[PDB]
Symmetry: C3
Subunit: 149 residues, 3 copies
Amino acid sequence: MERTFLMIKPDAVQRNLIGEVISRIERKGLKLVGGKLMQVPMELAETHYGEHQGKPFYNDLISFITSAPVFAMVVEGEDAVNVSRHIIGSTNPSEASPGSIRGDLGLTVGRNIIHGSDSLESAEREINLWFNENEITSYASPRDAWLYE
Amino acid sequence: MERTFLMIKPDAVQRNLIGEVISRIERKGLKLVGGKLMQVPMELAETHYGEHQGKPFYNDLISFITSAPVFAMVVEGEDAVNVSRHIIGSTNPSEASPGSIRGDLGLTVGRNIIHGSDSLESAEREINLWFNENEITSYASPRDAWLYE
Amino acid sequence: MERTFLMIKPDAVQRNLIGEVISRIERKGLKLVGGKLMQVPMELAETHYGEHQGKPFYNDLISFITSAPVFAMVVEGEDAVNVSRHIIGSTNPSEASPGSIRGDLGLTVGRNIIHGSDSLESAEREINLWFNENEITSYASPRDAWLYE
Ligand SMILES: Nc1ncnc2c1ncn2[C@@H]1O[C@H](COP(=O)(O)OP(=O)(O)O)[C@@H](O)[C@H]1O
Ligand SMILES: Nc1ncnc2c1ncn2[C@@H]1O[C@H](COP(=O)(O)OP(=O)(O)O)[C@@H](O)[C@H]1O
Ligand SMILES: Nc1ncnc2c1ncn2[C@@H]1O[C@H](COP(=O)(O)OP(=O)(O)O)[C@@H](O)[C@H]1O
Ligand SMILES: [Mg+2]
Ligand SMILES: [Mg+2]
Ligand SMILES: [Mg+2]
């Protein structure tokens, strides 16, 4: 089944919102298949956020993401990449739909709760960057027969 | 006052979200006026969803809706039909607004949690199809003085 | 730091939705810095809602806002006026996004749960009108370093 990379950022961690973010992912029908609380080393931060090296927020992003643990996830489900982006909401929490993770819990664009892969291509890159395959489980669940034709 | 027919589908029943969906309806201010847990007969499913007869998903539609019990409901309030459609959200859960029942809880279009009548006339037909009048109660909520001018 | 005036209306008070409304404000990141349960004198209502004096709904507005107590608040945070309106949703709960306070909890345009100031000008006006400076507390919170760069 399709997989994406999700990551609860240090603002949500330091706000004691880990369970609440997870609940939103779970209740959507997405399956957690990889999951670890970890500190992000500088090298990992930078390769993760490589595409943004040009920009004025870059230094502040790298600092932020490396300032306290994140909860990194691999998440499975039909159309999982676009589904997750949909529930996460716009990069800017003031544009994100109410009801979305960022919309409900994020205040500013730079501190916006959670990351999700932006495409299949960047899902497979990020999943490989953050996880080894031995860290990723595969398992059938009761509700699987009810989520899918 | 205006009434609509809502039905918590088998996916939400088998995922144990009955209470959660009812709560979404109740806090919107809609009044539950009829409700029963029931298995859907083949004949009722087919007449209820007859407008979809030769669409590719129809056989799946009919097998799903008959596969386990549903929670059938008559709900009352000003503009109940549209108000209900609005908190249910789009047919496809990944189009449905975050914060809507389908946006938050459904994963795929085939398994989208809850049904609501799509028009005033389809509400009266579906209400009549699913309930006899002696199944529909009549009562004043203390809250009404405050939902309306 | 930018601040705005939010007011939980007698309909949410009379449906016992006070904590639930306050929770959506808090979890967005907004900091409650002033707050008080109070009956609204007629003159306070009239000056707060003076703009609408001509309109056909004005008399209903005044009677409604004075029918039971309200919860008056001053809330603080970056872009607080717009951020507040965003989570609150459109005046009409039927056009407000699912997931917003008005979309999930309101039923009609006149019984729509909460007020927020509509610009920086009206924020300062409403805060001054409803509160004295000595009822508005100023304080560092733990989360602050995680909401903002
Ligand atoms: N204008 C900005 N100011 C500060 N930080 C930003 C800005 N734009 C993006 N960021 C940070 O960079 C992260 C990645 O940006 P981008 O990849 O465009 O969005 P997304 O995280 O939604 O995929 C954002 O989630 C955010 O934390
Ligand atoms: N493209 C599709 N693939 C699978 N199932 C579908 C599809 N379109 C509709 N359905 C199913 O048929 C039901 C009724 O369809 P429709 O009347 O168009 O939507 P709604 O239920 O939003 O009014 C939907 O609730 C869904 O269960
Ligand atoms: N057509 C209407 N009918 C009844 N009440 C209305 C109407 N329009 C506005 N109101 C009431 O007056 C309040 C103030 O109106 P307005 O400033 O237009 O909206 P908002 O409160 O979203 O800033 C609304 O929250 C609502 O309680
Ligand atoms: Mg991106
Ligand atoms: Mg339809
Ligand atoms: Mg206004």
